[PDB]
UniProtKB/Swiss-Prot annotation, chain A:
Annotated control of activity: Inhibited by pyridone-containing alpha-ketoamides compounds 13a and 13b. In turn, alpha-ketoamide 13b (tert-butyl (1-((S)-1-(((S)-4-(benzylamino)-3,4-dioxo-1-((S)-2-oxopyrrolidin-3-yl)butan-2-yl)amino)-3-cyclopropyl-1-oxopropan-2-yl)-2-oxo-1,2-dihydropyridin-3-yl)carbamate) inhibits SARS-CoV-2 replication in human lung cells. Inhibited ex vivo by michael acceptor inhibitor N3. Inhibited ex vivo by compound 11a and 11b.
Cross-link named Glycyl lysine isopeptide (Lys-Gly) (interchain with G-Cter in ubiquitin), sites: 4, 89
Compartment(s): Host cytoplasm; Host Golgi apparatus; Host nucleus
Descriptive protein name: 3C-like proteinase nsp5
Active-site feature positions: 40, 144
Record lineage: Viruses, Riboviria, Orthornavirae, Pisuviricota, Pisoniviricetes
Length: 301, 298
């Protein structure tokens, strides 16, 4: 019944440009009179093992940057670096600039990715930030600078800019202020993600969704403390819950009348006893890629 | 490996709200014409056996309220093509993309832009099921949402949403207003024919699993096309045509796995199951990726 559903991408499509240094092209995000893109656009292959980005930037001038919306050049009139992002001031304000914010998401939150190549969008899909600060994208060469976002009312919240792939095939990147999610750095080195864990808050959202749809065999008469639940959760490679997780489950708890800690007791029993050949929402597997917000969208609209 | 939808901006620029009485749904505004489901002209007294020709002749242009955002468009004419109402308006949409209307085949995929009150809400990839239903996420007010593919800068519209079935799947028309499947735009509980699994798509997805390093299900056995098809049909899988085998060529080459070798692996999965294992995260074989879908994303 539930599917991965992305936000409509049009407001973000109208902000995508390409940024080229020499023969190296990646994507950038054009908002008002600033283009945002990964700073490694200024790298050569020789620079990539461990670039001195500050040194590489001093040698760059505005006239070294080719910014294009489609085939139309956007003149660069200033440049600066903010953490791992390059900001290129341009001489034209993007007429399609939406209302927007830059947000830094928490692990477990979902967002839409507009996968782009040479400034042109190819596809849109929903991603979850894993607890180890990686995402399972579909990113090919040339996808850097593609962004992740959520849309609230008229307003686009940009939360992710793509920078790299890890040996295991997962992906890593920054917020739009250039700060990486997780311990990663933008160098052509092999870097390891932490062991991943299951996104507990999303599993709980899934159980609430099951209840909303009349599937509630797993509810019990008991409760737990948050600390007790977290200590058990960790033994099953589940993420510990935070206070923010408890809070964002508030609406679903209200919709069902099931206290968060009571659902935690139900989940604890599932982890300790298994499913015993039973299904939930038609699956023998628990799903962790739907947030409480995702559930409410697809259940209540 | 995840489902990927087409970027929806070209379609978002065409969505409007259409209202008649106490019924509101979505319309598609292309040039100076707005397309929408004709059941916008129904009421509760009509929905069970609506004589749409009688209902439509009794309507005036001024009974139709069309809003592009905060701007009302003036309806200067109306007509009906099968189950789609066509409202001529006095302004052309400058955001009209290059477009075509197509009727898709069962097994083909398309992107759905789900809308409510003329406002886009979500985008996702669907397949036209062999029984001509689609497994959508459509709520009250989603009617007139459209499905589409994009090729070059050209949008091919293939689906407009009309109804839900008691099993939770959905049914709709092409943009000429002809339903996919044996369904009717009346307020009745309708069942579909027996569904079948889209075999060529399952094979494409197994190839995707292989390209992604998942390969526990491969085997050295092989099979003929006909013997595979006999087993497929026993499990309510579509038989594989030679065209379908041809279409899988590029994925065969890329991975070096003969199509009929992948058929032999799928056969083993049908007869044995997956025994707790998963493929690309799923406990179930997925059939809503076409070979084209897999290739483009690889």
């Amino acid at each position: 019944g539930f599917r991965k559903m992305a936000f409509p991408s049009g407001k973000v499509e109208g902000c995508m440009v390409q940024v080229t240094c020499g023969t190296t092209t990646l994507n950038g995000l054009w908002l008002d009179d600033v283009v945002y893109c990964p700073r490694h656009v200024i790298c050569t292959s020789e620079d990539m093992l461990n670039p001195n980005y500050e040194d590489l930037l001093i040698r760059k001038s505005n006239h070294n940057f080719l910014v294009q919306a489609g085939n139309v050049q956007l003149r660069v009139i200033g440049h600066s670096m903010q953490n791992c992002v390059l900001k290129l001031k341009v001489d034209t304000a993007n007429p399609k600039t939406p209302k927007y914010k830059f947000v830094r998401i928490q692990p477990g939150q979902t967002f839409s990715v507009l996968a782009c190549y040479n400034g042109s969008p190819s596809g849109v899909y929903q991603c979850a930030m894993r607890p180890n600060f990686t995402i399972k994208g579909s990113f090919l060469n040339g996808s850097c600078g593609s962004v992740g976002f959520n849309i609230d009312y008229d307003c686009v919240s940009f939360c992710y800019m793509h920078h790299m792939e890890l040996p295991t095939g997962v992906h890593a990147g920054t917020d739009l202020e250039g700060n990486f999610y997780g311990p990663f750095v933008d160098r052509q080195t092999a870097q390891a993600a932490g062991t991943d864990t299951t996104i507990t808050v999303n599993v709980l959202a899934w159980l609430y969704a099951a209840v909303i749809n009349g599937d509630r065999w797993f509810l019990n008469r008991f409760t737990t403390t948050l600390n007790d639940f977290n200590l058990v959760a960790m033994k099953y490679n589940y993420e510990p819950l935070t206070q923010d997780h408890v809070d964002i489950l508030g609406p679903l708890s209200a919709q069902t009348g099931i206290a968060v800690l009571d659902m935690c007791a139900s989940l604890k029993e599932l982890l300790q006893n298994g499913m015993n050949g039973r299904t939930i929402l038609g699956s023998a597997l628990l799903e962790d890629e739907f947030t409480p917000f995702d559930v409410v969208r697809q259940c209540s609209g």
